[PDB]
Design an enzyme around this catalytic site. Structure first.
Site, mmCIF file in Angstrom:
data_model
loop_
_atom_site.group_PDB
_atom_site.id
_atom_site.type_symbol
_atom_site.label_atom_id
_atom_site.label_comp_id
_atom_site.label_asym_id
_atom_site.label_seq_id
_atom_site.Cartn_x
_atom_site.Cartn_y
_atom_site.Cartn_z
ATOM 1 N N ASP A 155 38.414 44.433 36.340
ATOM 2 C CA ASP A 155 38.294 43.277 37.262
ATOM 3 C C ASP A 155 37.234 42.320 36.767
ATOM 4 O OD1 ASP A 155 39.116 45.674 38.428
ATOM 5 O OD2 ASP A 155 38.365 45.123 40.418
ATOM 6 N N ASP A 176 43.260 43.711 35.777
ATOM 7 C CA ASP A 176 43.094 43.992 37.200
ATOM 8 C C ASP A 176 42.730 42.663 37.881
ATOM 9 O OD1 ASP A 176 42.039 45.336 39.770
ATOM 10 O OD2 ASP A 176 42.462 47.134 38.589
ATOM 11 N N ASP A 177 42.153 42.702 39.079
ATOM 12 C CA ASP A 177 41.879 41.455 39.796
ATOM 13 C C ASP A 177 41.092 40.460 38.985
ATOM 14 O OD1 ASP A 177 43.159 41.681 42.278
ATOM 15 O OD2 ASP A 177 41.610 43.055 42.977
ATOM 16 N N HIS A 198 45.680 41.034 38.092
ATOM 17 C CA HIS A 198 46.277 41.303 39.394
ATOM 18 C C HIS A 198 46.116 40.137 40.368
ATOM 19 C CE1 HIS A 198 46.116 45.992 38.737
ATOM 20 N NE2 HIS A 198 46.919 45.371 37.889
ATOM 21 N N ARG A 231 46.771 37.033 46.949
ATOM 22 C CA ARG A 231 46.786 38.370 47.552
ATOM 23 C C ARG A 231 45.692 38.573 48.582
ATOM 24 N NH1 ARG A 231 46.849 44.290 44.477
ATOM 25 N NH2 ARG A 231 44.941 43.469 43.479
ATOM 26 N N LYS A 233 44.560 41.777 51.261
ATOM 27 C CA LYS A 233 44.835 43.148 51.663
ATOM 28 C C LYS A 233 43.796 43.584 52.653
ATOM 29 C CE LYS A 233 44.157 44.299 47.367
ATOM 30 N NZ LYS A 233 43.543 45.443 46.635
#
Ligand SMILES: *[C@@H]1O[C@H](CO)[C@@H](O[C@@H]2O[C@H](CO)[C@@H](O[C@@H]3O[C@H](CO[C@H]4O[C@H](CO[C@H]5O[C@H](CO)[C@@H](O)[C@H](O)[C@@H]5O)[C@@H](O)[C@H](O)[C@@H]4O)[C@@H](O)[C@H](O[C@H]4O[C@H](CO)[C@@H](O)[C@H](O)[C@@H]4O)[C@@H]3O)[C@H](O)[C@H]2NC(C)=O)[C@H](O)[C@H]1NC(C)=O
Length: 339
Positions: A155, A176-177, A198, A231, A233
Site C-alpha cells: 500500500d 495494494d491500495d 487496489h 472504494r 468499506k
C-alpha cells in the site's frame, strides 16, 4: 545544510542539534530504523543519493519521522530503494517472511514531505498516523518490480488518526491500495496517478481505536490497471462514521474487479455479503467518475445496510465495460447512484 550524514547511527545521534540535515546515500543497518523522530521544530531533512537498507526479517519501520514544522525533501537524483524483492514472497504482511513497514510519518505537525522517490518497499510504504496538517507532495512510490517478483500488501498511503493530510501529485505503482483512509478528518488525495494496485480506498472503517472518517476529498486522479477504482468499506458489526466524502474527476482504465465499490460487510478482511448499519456512509459525493472495467469485473457494487447510507449525490458517473451487479442493496433513493 547544518549536517550531512552518510552514516545512519551518526544521523540519529546528531539530528536534534541540526537545523538542516542531509541524509546522503545512507545504508541503514539491517533490522534498524533510520530514526528521525524527535527532530528540533523547524528542521529540514533532505534525502540525497541512494538510501538503502540491510536485510532482516522484522517489522520495521525502515524510516521514522516526527516533529513540528518539519520539511522532508528529496534532492535531484535521490532515491530510497528498499530492494523489497529480498522479502517479497507473494504473501506480504499476511504470511511468509516477517517484512518491515517502510516509512512512519507519525506525530508530524504542520509538516511537509515533498518529492521523495521510493522504490521497492518490502510491504506498506507510508503509514500516516497521529499527523496534524501534513502535506505529501509529488511523492513517487515505484513498486512495479513487485508485479513479477512477489510484491503483496505494498500500500502506498495508509492514513489513520490524522487531520489535515494533503496528498498531492503522488505517482504510485504497486500491488495494494493506492490510498487507504482508516480514519481521519480533512484528508485530501489529489492530482495522483495510481497504477497496478487496489484503488483509492476509504476503510475498512470500524473495529479500530479510531473509526471516524470525515471531510475527505479524493480528486483529479487516474486509476489504471487496478482491482478497484472508487472504494469504501466498512466493518461488519462495527461502530464508526464515514461522512462528507467527495470523489471527483476520477478517471479509470482497465479496472479488474469493481469500478466503484461501496460495501458495509467486511469481517476479518473479507466481505460477508450481509451489510451492517453501525458505520453510516453519509454526505457522499461522486462527480465525474469515468472509465473502463474489465469484462470479468463489475461496474458498480453498492451494498448498504437498511437506513445506513443517506445524503448521496452522484453525477457524471460513467463506468462501463464490466458486468452490472444484481446484488446491490439499499442505494440512497434520488441520489443518482445506480449499479
Ligand atoms: C485541512 O487540511 C489542509 C491541508 O493540510 C489545511 O491546509 C493547509 O493549512 C496550513 C496551515 O495550517 C497551510 O500552511 C500555511 O500556508 C500559508 C499559505 O501558504 C502557501 O502560500 C505561500 C504564500 O503564497 C504567495 O507567496 C509566494 C512567495 O512568498 C508566491 O510564490 C506565491 O505565488 C503566492 O503569491 C507560499 O509561499 C507557499 O508555498 C504556499 O503555497 C503560509 O503562509 C503559512 O506559513 C505561515 O506559518 C509558517 C510557520 O510554519 C511561517 O514560516 C510563515 O511565515 C507563515 O507565518 C503556512 O505554511 C497549508 O498551505 C495548507 N495547505 C493547503 C494545500 O491548503 C487546512 O487548513 C485544513 N483545514 C482546516 C479547517 O484546518
Amino acid at each position: 545544510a547544518s549536517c550531512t550524514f552518510t552514516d545512519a547511527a551518526a544521523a540519529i545521534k546528531g539530528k536534534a542539534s541540526c537545523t538542516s540535515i542531509i541524509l546522503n546515500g545512507i545504508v541503514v543497518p539491517a533490522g534498524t530504523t533510520l530514526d528521525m523522530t524527535g527532530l528540533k521544530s523547524g528542521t529540514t531533512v533532505t534525502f540525497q543519493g541512494k538510501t538503502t537498507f540491510g536485510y532482516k526479517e522484522w517489522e520495521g519501520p525502515l524510516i521514522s519521522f516526527s516533529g513540528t514544522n518539519i520539511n522532508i525533501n528529496g534532492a535531484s537524483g535521490h532515491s530510497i530503494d528498499c530492494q523489497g524483492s529480498r522479502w517479497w514472497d507473494s504473501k506480504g504482511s499476511n504470511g511468509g517472511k516477517t517484512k518491515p513497514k517502510f516509512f512512519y510519518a507519525h506525530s508530524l505537525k504542520s509538516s511537509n514531505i515533498k518529492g521523495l522517490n521510493v522504490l521497492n518497499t518490502p510491504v506498506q510504504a507510508f503509514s500516516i498516523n497521529s499527523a496534524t496538517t501534513l502535506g505529501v507532495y509529488d511523492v513517487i512510490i515505484d513498486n512495479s518490480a513487485g508485479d513479477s517478483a512477489g510484491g503483496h500488501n505494498t500500500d502506498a498511503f495508509d492514513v489513520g488518526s490524522s487531520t489535515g493530510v494533503y496528498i498531492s501529485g503522488a505517482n504510485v505503482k504497486n500491488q495494494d491500495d493506492c490510498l487507504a483512509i482508516n480514519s481521519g478528518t480533512n484528508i485530501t488525495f489529489t492530482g495522483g496517478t495510481c497504477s497496478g494496485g487496489h484503488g483509492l480506498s476509504i476503510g475498512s472503517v470500524g473495529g479500530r481505536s479510531d473509526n471516524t472518517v470525515k471531510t475527505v476529498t479524493i480528486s483529479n486522479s487516474k486509476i489504471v490497471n487496478s482491482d478497484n477504482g472508487v472504494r469504501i468499506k466498512t466493518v461488519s458489526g462495527a461502530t464508526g462514521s464515514v461522512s462528507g466524502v467527495t470523489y471527483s474527476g476520477i478517471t479509470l482504465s482497465n479496472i479488474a474487479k469493481y469500478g466503484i465499490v461501496i460495501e458495509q460487510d467486511y469481517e476479518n478482511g473479507s466481505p460477508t455479503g450481509t451489510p451492517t448499519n453501525g458505520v453510516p456512509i453519509t454526505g457522499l459525493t461522486l462527480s465525474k467518475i469515468t472509465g473502463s472495467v474489465a469484462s470479468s469485473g463489475t461496474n458498480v457494487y453498492i451494498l448498504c445496510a437498511s437506513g445506513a447510507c443517506s445524503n448521496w449525490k452522484w453525477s457524471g458517473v460513467s463506468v462501463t465495460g464490466g458486468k452490472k451487479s444484481t446484488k446491490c442493496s439499499n442505494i440512497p433513493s434520488g441520489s443518482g447512484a445506480a449499479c
